[PDB]
């Protein structure tokens, strides 16, 4: 090759894609904007494609570049792994972990998770992000996130996925609803149009639709659905970790289980095969598996 | 240019079969009833009632016309029934929006209050940014919205409801737990976690801090797509400190010894929660019930 | 109290239709302030608002919608008295206001309008295309006289007449593998290369039903989908009346029938029971039924 | 500073267990190879290879180091492969917006031509109002939009494609069919059907007409239709007259004797159809082929 791909140039492009700000990327790589920009342009001239758009209006990842940045983050982490094997035993539990969870998992998991994580890894705080599955995947690819908590199925190249627990669904209803007499709700009944569902985008929506032979309230969360049910707007479906996660006094909303066969999702953690801190992933997974909402 | 009045003449005349008792039930003289009735028959250019000294009887065309007139009058009474039913303003859903930093900490208390005073009014609920709630309010997709001042929009009314102070949220083992109050000027530091741009609470927190020399403004950490809950978890895990509105401080399920809050040193910063709605919204009674239930929540 | 007049009913119905005091007043041969006084007197008497009290806009209240629907009914029944009195009035000498859903209009009107001019040349069409539920709202208030929809459709005080069954077909680029088949098995349409209308269209649901349990281009139309297909983006499903309704040279797009049992929709017309021009509805229905795209007719009943 | 070349040196040396064969495989002299391997050893402060006179072989840590290095070389090669696959700009779908009064009259001619030069470029297509398409171009949700001038936007490039005269559309039995051309001042009448606000075609038509005295400014009938085709149906049924862009006049399925068209009297009103796209859009060649296919 005319020019040798260097690990510094890859560092530039991955940091620049994470930060989406020339200044902040430059300072994260401990150099000036002209230095960083020179390196990026060098890598681009050599590869013969644009990784970022030729604009100093802003920082836009090209589609080709997104793929290149995913790869480059892999490369950077394997290299890091070489230096780890060289100077072994350095502390993997002494820096923040960047963790994403999908909308319908995070609010119901993190609070149970965090005290155990503190008992085993007090030097590991959490930078937390909640979002749709595909955005979390994009962020795992750039390295903006270290680990993401999602629902199976989930596959991604050079990404590891470890199943953590199985989470059953429940029917949510006004306390004065007819169904409150039933001991278990059978799923055909859910074919009503008083069923409140999450908007398109949330994989949980489709898991619920799949569990049934409707009113879609979008730009909404499970919480605002629960508020709507409490006010008497209809009924809904919650994952088990969300059933007691609320601030109503009793006598406002009730839950009832599904008549067998009980529908469920599998909650899992995903991270890059090359991640140089596998012990943090382990401490995290452990802490999830051990917390209250994670047990039968 | 026929009228419900003359239609009522010919229906009553057809029922009574007698001009006198008909004019009597229509509370008019015999002449007015007569002239009415076939100023109508001359308008239609047909004979509804036969020529007669004595008998009131219906020509064959007349029978159909009178039956049609009775249908018309009954349906016209339908309008008054519909109207009557329409007078109750607490018998349909209310579509309510609240900003992201208010809804989660308001609706749990609001919903039962509102249920006490307006059982027949379920809520359709949206959480969103202020400018979006504003748009939905203008298009009538939302009936009322719960925002923080300032808020002034053409053809929209705004009612201040209450003031809500801010508190400082910190890990339970943080050095600031030794303080009784936090001086806002201490908050300028990278460990301060803020909501992204777009949330007005971000700027209420930043304005609540004193001004800085050139170049060391905004040392805080901005966390994009945060909610106040995910900040709460980041703080609980020991990542930094943040600022919560008062209604959020106990809105969680941690055991003691995970997170603490401390007040600000005077003057305590605060926001004014308001309800806004279109000036010509036709259901004022629902706005009243909503505003009062919100006020009783605090 | 104040007694309700047919005049006031006409004020509110015309206002609800035009959504504009100028065109409403004008339509009632009356000044704007006159019209406003009338409406306000009726609102005072019923004791509810029919229209929002706003200088800037004309907006129906929830109760006002039901009241305007009922008023339009009252007015048409009153007009029906004149019809009974001296029948044989010319019902074919004024425009007819007609709605059709987005997946019917573009493909039916060009066939219909010449049959119509043949049998009723003094009846021009004012035409609107929109979603089923909006066409329905406009039939209730009187903005439209007749709407052209797909079954099922059933509404209070509205009559519905099935007109013809229309089968679906599969649309593919001309160089697509399936061009080899004489028919297409509905199971095969279960992949990500199927382009569908967004959720507002009933044709979406009908195509989903035809396919065992898909790329949705929202805000698309069937025409837009056709272009996308023509460029090789994927495949789609069209109602029969759409299949020859394009301006492509031959050899760009191909259509193939479904393998039996062929899925279909039933095209129907709906109008107000009280409409005082039943001859106009009749000529409209007949003209549709004499269209080439309608030759199979239908055995469907209300 | 660790290089990919040093990693290649140690991976090769490990596989061959012979300096001679390793340096031959790496196209360098043996001192070059050994100097690089040593420099990596100094930098990692660990010995990857036996410091042995007789034989070349891996220390315990060296084996994991070589194992990691191979993964580095593999994935770095993936970078180059992705880049080579990305050079071809005519091998993925393109997202194109067109306004309501252009799309239906442009795509049927455009698409087969585009297919001849760029078969691996299918189109995702969206029709909408000018400002919506503008927004989608800006956010990147569309790659190119076909709009009518005037159009100017920040960081956005505009290329005129063609000029299009306007025509008057009328039912075939209409009195105006006797005329050779229509004076635009005839159009101020309730029988003129126009598109609603939002369609820039509406203003193009209105501003093609002479401004009139107070009280009579907008006598035309406005319709809610986003489609000229709906208006064409109304005109066909004898409801009124209307105005079409030239590329729409023959785009219909009526037999002769149903609708007619007459030109405006001079000077004839017209619009300029143009293509807009972001200046830093990373597939300038796909854009170029789109625009050439329109002409």
XYZ file of N, CA, C and O in Angstrom, chain A residues 101-103 106-108 110-111 127-131 221 223, chain B residues 99-105 127-129 169 193-197 199 201-202 221-236 241-245 248 251:
228
model
N -29.988 -0.076 27.405
C -31.040 -1.053 27.554
C -32.266 -0.567 26.761
O -32.512 0.650 26.589
N -33.003 -1.512 26.201
C -34.189 -1.062 25.474
C -35.229 -0.471 26.463
O -35.238 -0.805 27.658
N -36.065 0.441 25.953
C -37.071 1.176 26.726
C -37.913 0.368 27.686
O -38.291 0.849 28.754
N -34.886 -1.254 30.639
C -34.137 -0.368 31.536
C -34.761 0.123 32.847
O -34.178 -0.067 33.932
N -35.964 0.725 32.773
C -36.609 1.285 33.972
C -36.950 0.232 35.040
O -37.082 0.540 36.231
N -37.079 -1.010 34.600
C -37.517 -2.096 35.459
C -36.363 -2.978 35.873
O -36.549 -3.890 36.665
N -32.543 -1.622 35.907
C -31.439 -0.898 36.539
C -31.545 -0.696 38.065
O -30.529 -0.807 38.771
N -32.757 -0.409 38.590
C -32.782 -0.138 40.032
C -32.455 -1.370 40.870
O -31.956 -1.234 41.984
N -22.669 4.556 32.956
C -23.223 5.521 32.044
C -24.381 4.806 31.337
O -24.184 3.787 30.706
N -25.601 5.296 31.478
C -26.776 4.555 30.985
C -27.512 5.290 29.907
O -27.755 6.502 30.016
N -27.862 4.525 28.881
C -28.651 4.990 27.788
C -29.805 4.014 27.488
O -29.610 2.801 27.471
N -31.008 4.550 27.282
C -32.181 3.746 26.933
C -32.615 4.129 25.568
O -32.651 5.317 25.256
N -32.932 3.136 24.745
C -33.315 3.433 23.362
C -33.898 2.220 22.642
O -33.998 1.134 23.234
N -44.913 5.282 26.472
C -44.109 4.249 27.155
C -45.015 3.301 27.938
O -46.233 3.506 28.002
N -45.141 3.233 30.962
C -45.623 4.008 32.097
C -46.878 4.792 31.754
O -47.812 4.851 32.547
N -45.042 17.605 29.897
C -43.624 17.468 29.546
C -42.929 16.280 30.276
O -43.378 15.794 31.289
N -41.821 15.815 29.707
C -41.105 14.664 30.210
C -40.718 14.769 31.671
O -40.673 13.758 32.340
N -40.433 15.974 32.172
C -39.953 16.085 33.556
C -41.056 16.383 34.539
O -40.780 16.719 35.708
N -42.310 16.290 34.071
C -43.474 16.512 34.928
C -44.365 15.252 34.998
O -44.656 14.761 36.075
N -44.787 14.747 33.840
C -45.687 13.596 33.773
C -45.447 12.450 34.744
O -46.333 12.098 35.543
N -44.239 11.881 34.725
C -43.979 10.692 35.532
C -44.206 10.898 37.006
O -44.402 9.937 37.734
N -44.142 12.144 37.454
C -44.157 12.423 38.883
C -45.507 13.075 39.265
O -45.798 13.333 40.427
N -46.566 11.977 26.923
C -45.432 12.750 27.429
C -44.577 13.181 26.246
O -44.415 12.436 25.290
N -44.076 14.411 26.279
C -43.295 14.900 25.133
C -42.595 16.246 25.471
O -42.793 16.779 26.553
N -41.768 16.770 24.577
C -41.158 18.100 24.758
C -42.176 19.207 24.656
O -43.207 19.053 23.982
N -29.452 15.688 43.915
C -29.439 14.253 44.005
C -28.005 13.736 43.946
O -27.244 14.048 43.022
N -24.744 15.759 36.109
C -25.401 15.174 34.938
C -26.695 15.923 34.548
O -27.649 15.979 35.340
N -26.741 16.436 33.316
C -27.903 17.163 32.787
C -28.614 16.452 31.651
O -28.017 15.671 30.873
N -29.888 16.763 31.536
C -30.671 16.353 30.384
C -30.190 17.054 29.141
O -29.654 18.181 29.225
N -30.424 16.417 27.996
C -30.090 16.988 26.695
C -30.816 18.287 26.353
O -31.771 18.684 27.029
N -30.346 18.977 25.318
C -31.009 20.199 24.853
C -32.397 19.801 24.410
O -32.626 18.655 23.998
N -35.009 19.741 26.499
C -35.757 19.747 27.775
C -35.595 21.096 28.467
O -34.471 21.452 28.853
N -36.138 21.894 31.410
C -35.541 21.695 32.741
C -33.991 21.833 32.711
O -33.412 22.354 33.654
N -33.347 21.370 31.629
C -31.903 21.581 31.418
C -31.509 23.027 31.712
O -30.632 23.305 32.542
N -21.752 17.328 32.459
C -21.934 16.222 31.530
C -23.360 16.223 31.040
O -24.293 16.158 31.841
N -23.519 16.327 29.725
C -24.818 16.229 29.089
C -25.070 14.788 28.669
O -24.222 14.134 28.053
N -26.223 14.263 29.020
C -26.487 12.914 28.618
C -27.694 12.900 27.711
O -28.829 13.078 28.158
N -27.408 12.724 26.421
C -28.408 12.730 25.358
C -29.460 11.663 25.615
O -29.125 10.570 26.084
N -30.720 11.980 25.319
C -31.792 10.989 25.353
C -31.956 10.428 26.758
O -32.536 9.352 26.958
N -31.414 11.150 27.728
C -31.659 10.829 29.115
C -33.132 11.047 29.403
O -33.808 11.797 28.645
N -33.618 10.356 30.450
C -34.777 10.811 31.266
C -34.283 11.048 32.683
O -33.161 10.644 33.038
N -35.098 11.682 33.511
C -34.607 11.994 34.846
C -34.378 10.692 35.605
O -33.548 10.637 36.487
N -35.109 9.640 35.240
C -34.923 8.313 35.825
C -33.577 7.664 35.471
O -32.940 7.005 36.331
N -33.121 7.821 34.224
C -31.853 7.175 33.885
C -30.696 7.940 34.527
O -29.710 7.322 34.957
N -30.818 9.269 34.615
C -29.897 10.048 35.442
C -29.945 9.545 36.890
O -28.928 9.370 37.527
N -31.132 9.278 37.411
C -31.233 8.836 38.790
C -30.440 7.534 38.979
O -29.756 7.362 39.990
N -30.542 6.620 38.015
C -29.779 5.375 38.076
C -28.282 5.591 37.949
O -27.523 4.886 38.606
N -27.868 6.525 37.081
C -26.442 6.807 36.904
C -25.892 7.363 38.205
O -24.786 6.984 38.651
N -26.666 8.238 38.842
C -26.264 8.775 40.154
C -26.202 7.676 41.193
O -25.216 7.562 41.944
N -27.232 6.831 41.227
C -27.233 5.720 42.181
C -26.005 4.831 42.003
O -25.420 4.372 42.983
N -23.633 13.485 40.112
C -24.683 14.083 40.903
C -25.630 14.713 39.903
O -25.248 14.925 38.775
N -26.851 15.035 40.320
C -27.761 15.744 39.420
C -28.773 16.601 40.193
O -28.690 16.752 41.422
N -29.747 17.138 39.470
C -30.738 18.025 40.050
C -32.115 17.494 39.646
O -32.311 17.201 38.479
N -33.021 17.333 40.618
C -34.395 16.839 40.413
C -35.451 17.868 40.842
O -35.241 18.617 41.791
N -36.617 17.861 40.191
C -37.693 18.709 40.720
C -38.271 18.024 41.922
O -38.112 16.811 42.040
N -40.118 14.710 41.875
C -39.369 13.483 41.541
C -38.524 12.864 42.701
O -38.028 11.745 42.559
N -39.819 9.581 44.075
C -40.437 8.765 43.045
C -39.521 7.615 42.577
O -39.108 7.546 41.416
